[PDB]
Structures are given as structure tokens and as C-alpha cells.
């Protein structure tokens, strides 16, 4: 009735703060893993050059 | 009963009609003449364009049909022919050089090109050994565009020839073409890499000599005749009839070709 409730009450703030920090850490890790991917595709100039070779020009 | 397979590759209908008339009038109907696009034996191909299914493009100077200008010359011009795909598809000669620039993998194409060059090199060295020459002349176009196909051609041709024990001398396209037309007696065996410029040189030599029939060695194994003009086609038909086992008919066609090049059909 008295002791355990008082100690739980004393615990509450630190746990709340630590859990808030943990959530912010999760969000930060989520953000840090985002990178914009740039893909390289075969230049069409080579395709045009090959077309010329097929044209036998 | 027997069959002669006519292939058309860039040949005008007049030449094909003349060839059909010549065979029909000379053969007499014993051997039928069917038309197709690919064959391995008993085949005559009409037209400058290379047919599908040929890996070697040898040509010589037949003694009977020697022009008075080129009397006594003896040189064998062998053109290496890579496998030919459909006209729409990119040819192996083009692909082997452009895919490397594009970065695409070129393993299978290299393997196919290597096999074709090895077969062509084996044919060339065999001709050189038969004629007795010690050194052959490789012909590669020195254009910057063809900086990969020629490199593989030289790497493989020299390897096979050196393994056989003969020497190789590499040269370009303009110098060899001028030498072959002006002073051909200084060249015994000349191999040509697969280009659209070497093909013209082979045709020019086959025509300047007086008109001859080129021999094509196919993948299936055999020899097929090739012509581009009235006289060349007539000689090609005469050789083909000789192969079938007709000597008198072959001689008559050869004589008709020598006398009246453009109108052999009426001449005989």
C-alpha cells in the first residue's frame, strides 16, 4: 500500500525520459538510413554507334 | 533427282535468272535447281553479300581462267567470316566492338569469334603449307573503331599460325589492296579479318583477275561456290557441276565463260 507505490512513483520520471530518448534514437536511425539511389544506364550514344555499324556506314 | 541450292545475297534478279538458265540448259533437267537461303553442300551463292552459315571465304587464281594481264600469278586470299545473324540483329563483328565500349559482357561473343578465327586460321595455314609458303600476310583495318575485333583477330591468328610453325606479317587495308592489285606476285597467302572493307577487297581481287568463283567453307563442313557477276557465277556453276561429277558440262560452261562473259547462256 505504501512502499512499493512510492518507489514506482520515484521511478516513473527516469523511465519516461529514457524511453523518450530511445524513441528519438529510433527516429534518428530511421532517418540516417535514407539515401537517394542514383542508377547508371547505358548511354544511348553507343546504341546509335552500333546502329550505324548495322547500317554499314 | 540431284539438287543444286541457289542462295541469293544482294544479287540482281538478272544474274539469278542467268544462272538458272545456264544450269537448266547445260544440265538438261537431270539435276533440279532449288532456291534457298542456307546450305552446306552443292550450293551456289550469288551476290556480293555474305550468306548465312559460312566461316571461311577462300579465293584463288584458277589457271584456266587467268586473265592475260595476271598470267602466272598465284596468291590465295582467305577472308575470315564470323557467324551471320539475322539482318535486323546486330552482327557479331559489330557487337564484339560496341558492347565492350558499352560495358556489356562479351564472353559468348568472344568465344564464338575465337572459334571462327581458329577455323579460318587453320584453313589459311593449310593452304600455305600446301603451296609451300613460309609466311602469311594478315590484313586488319587500322581504323580506331575496329580496335577490338582486329586485336582478337591478330591475337588468335598469330597464335595458331605460330603454333603451326609459319610466320605472320600484319598489314592494313589500303597498302595490301594496292599491292594485291598492282604487284600480287609478292604475296602468297593473305588472310583478311572480317570487315565490310576486306569483303570489298576480296571482291575486287576476284574480279580484277578476270572473274573467278570464291569458295566458302561452312560450319557443317564442305565447300560452296560463290559468284557476283555473269562470268563469276558461270564459273561457280561449272565448278559445282564438276563436283557433282559432270566433267564435259563443266568444261563447256568454262569455255563459254571464257569466250562470252556477259552472255554465256546464249554462247553455249
Amino acid at each position: 500500500d505504501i512502499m512499493v507505490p512510492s518507489f514506482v512513483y520515484n521511478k516513473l520520471p527516469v523511465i519516461h525520459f529514457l524511453q523518450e530518448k530511445r524513441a528519438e534514437q529510433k527516429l534518428r536511425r530511421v532517418l540516417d538510413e535514407t539515401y537517394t539511389e542514383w542508377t547508371e544506364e547505358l548511354d544511348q550514344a553507343h546504341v546509335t554507334d552500333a546502329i550505324t555499324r548495322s547500317l554499314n556506314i | 533427282s540431284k539438287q543444286l541450292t541457289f542462295i541469293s545475297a544482294g544479287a540482281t534478279a538478272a544474274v539469278l535468272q542467268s544462272a538458272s538458265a545456264i544450269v537448266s540448259k547445260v544440265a538438261g533437267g537431270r539435276v533440279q535447281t532449288k532456291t534457298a537461303k542456307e546450305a552446306g553442300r552443292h550450293a551456289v551463292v550469288v551476290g556480293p553479300e555474305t550468306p548465312i552459315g559460312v566461316h571461311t571465304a577462300v579465293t584463288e587464281v584458277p589457271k584456266s581462267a587467268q586473265d592475260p594481264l595476271f598470267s602466272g600469278v598465284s596468291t590465295v586470299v582467305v577472308r575470315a567470316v564470323l557467324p551471320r545473324a539475322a539482318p535486323d540483329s546486330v552482327q557479331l563483328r559489330d557487337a564484339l566492338d560496341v558492347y565492350a565500349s558499352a560495358g556489356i559482357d562479351t564472353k559468348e561473343e568472344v568465344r564464338s569469334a575465337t572459334e571462327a578465327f581458329k577455323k579460318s586460321a587453320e584453313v589459311a595455314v593449310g593452304k600455305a603449307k600446301a603451296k609451300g609458303v613460309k609466311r602469311i600476310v594478315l590484313v586488319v583495318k587500322q581504323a580506331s573503331k575496329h580496335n577490338c575485333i582486329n586485336e582478337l583477330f591478330k591475337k588468335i591468328s598469330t597464335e595458331t599460325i605460330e603454333s603451326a610453325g609459319l610466320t605472320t606479317e600484319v598489314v592494313g587495308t589500303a597498302a595490301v589492296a594496292n599491292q594485291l592489285i598492282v604487284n600480287p606476285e609478292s604475296l602468297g597467302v593473305v588472310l583478311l579479318n572480317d570487315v565490310a572493307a576486306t569483303e570489298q577487297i576480296e571482291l575486287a581481287f576476284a574480279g580484277v583477275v578476270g572473274g573467278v568463283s570464291r569458295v566458302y567453307h561452312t560450319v557443317e563442313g564442305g565447300k560452296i561456290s560463290a559468284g557476283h557477276s555473269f562470268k563469276s557465277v558461270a564459273l561457280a556453276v561449272a565448278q559445282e557441276l564438276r563436283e557433282l561429277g559432270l566433267s564435259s558440262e563443266a568444261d563447256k560452261v568454262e569455255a563459254a565463260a571464257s569466250k562470252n562473259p556477259r552472255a554465256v547462256v546464249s554462247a553455249l
Side-chain angles (χ1 to χ4, degrees):
Chain A
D1 304 335
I2 297 170
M3 305 198 293
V4 170
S6 294
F7 281 83
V8 172
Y9 207 146
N10 298 347
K11 277 186 180 299
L12 290 177
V14 174
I15 290 172
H16 180 78
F17 169 84
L18 296 175
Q19 291 182 354
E20 286 182 1
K21 289 294 188 178
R22 173 56 175 175
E24 283 190 355
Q25 188 186 47
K26 293 202 207 74
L27 284 176
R28 189 179 66 181
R29 165 162 283 97
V30 167
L31 172 55
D32 293 1
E33 289 185 353
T34 296
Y35 56 80
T36 175
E37 172 174 354
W38 292 110
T39 186
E40 56 182 355
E41 183 274 343
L42 171 54
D43 184 2
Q44 303 301 319
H46 304 80
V47 185
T48 312
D49 194 329
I51 286 165
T52 310
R53 297 173 188 274
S54 181
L55 281 164
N56 310 341
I57 293 164
Chain B
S1 60
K2 306 178 181 180
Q3 298 179 0
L4 287 179
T5 303
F6 284 74
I7 309 178
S8 177
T12 59
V15 184
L16 299 175
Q17 192 282 339
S18 60
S20 180
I22 294 160
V23 58
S24 62
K25 181 175 178 180
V26 175
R30 301 197 303 272
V31 47
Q32 304 178 359
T33 64
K34 184 174 183 178
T35 303
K37 298 180 179 180
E38 182 276 349
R41 303 182 299 91
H42 300 167
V44 180
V45 61
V46 188
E49 176 178 1
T50 303
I52 302 175
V54 295
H55 56 55
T56 305
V58 54
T59 171
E60 309 179 3
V61 177
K63 304 175 183 178
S64 301
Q66 293 193 1
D67 182 79
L69 182 63
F70 286 81
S71 300
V73 70
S74 180
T75 183
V76 178
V77 188
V78 184
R79 175 168 62 87
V81 180
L82 307 182
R84 286 287 180 272
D88 304 2
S89 60
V90 183
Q91 303 300 345
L92 189 63
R93 66 194 180 90
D94 309 332
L96 175 57
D97 177 69
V98 71
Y99 290 179
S101 184
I104 303 178
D105 65 330
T106 318
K107 295 183 177 181
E108 191 282 339
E109 294 185 345
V110 161
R111 182 180 63 185
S112 180
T114 290
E115 182 178 358
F117 287 143
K118 285 182 175 180
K119 294 182 178 181
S120 299
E122 288 178 2
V123 173
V125 63
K127 289 289 186 178
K129 182 178 178 181
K131 180 169 288 189
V133 67
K134 311 171 185 177
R135 184 180 64 180
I136 67 96
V137 180
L138 303 174
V139 173
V140 300
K141 187 172 180 59
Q142 300 177 357
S144 179
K145 296 204 304 185
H146 310 262
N147 189 22
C148 179
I149 185 176
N150 68 336
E151 187 66 9
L152 187 67
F153 164 87
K154 297 188 298 183
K155 171 176 172 297
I156 301 175
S157 300
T158 193
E159 173 179 351
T160 300
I161 298 161
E162 290 179 3
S163 180
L166 302 183
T167 307
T168 68
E169 181 181 3
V170 67
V171 291
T173 185
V176 63
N178 175 263
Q179 178 178 351
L180 188 65
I181 297 171
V182 178
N183 181 269
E185 300 182 1
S186 54
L187 303 178
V189 175
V190 49
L191 187 72
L192 312 178
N193 71 327
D194 185 68
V195 200
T198 60
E199 178 180 358
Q200 299 177 357
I201 287 169
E202 183 178 0
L203 287 166
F205 175 70
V208 68
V209 171
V212 301
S213 59
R214 305 167 295 172
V215 178
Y216 277 90
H217 307 163
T218 58
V219 302
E220 300 180 0
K223 306 177 183 179
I224 66 183
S225 303
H228 59 284
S229 63
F230 298 91
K231 184 174 180 180
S232 299
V233 169
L235 296 176
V237 173
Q239 182 178 359
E240 196 72 302
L241 295 176
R242 180 183 299 177
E243 182 174 354
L244 291 180
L246 303 177
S247 60
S248 180
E249 299 186 9
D251 296 359
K252 288 187 174 183
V253 177
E254 178 274 354
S258 301
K259 285 188 173 183
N260 194 358
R262 303 187 307 274
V264 298
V265 63
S266 300
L268 60 79

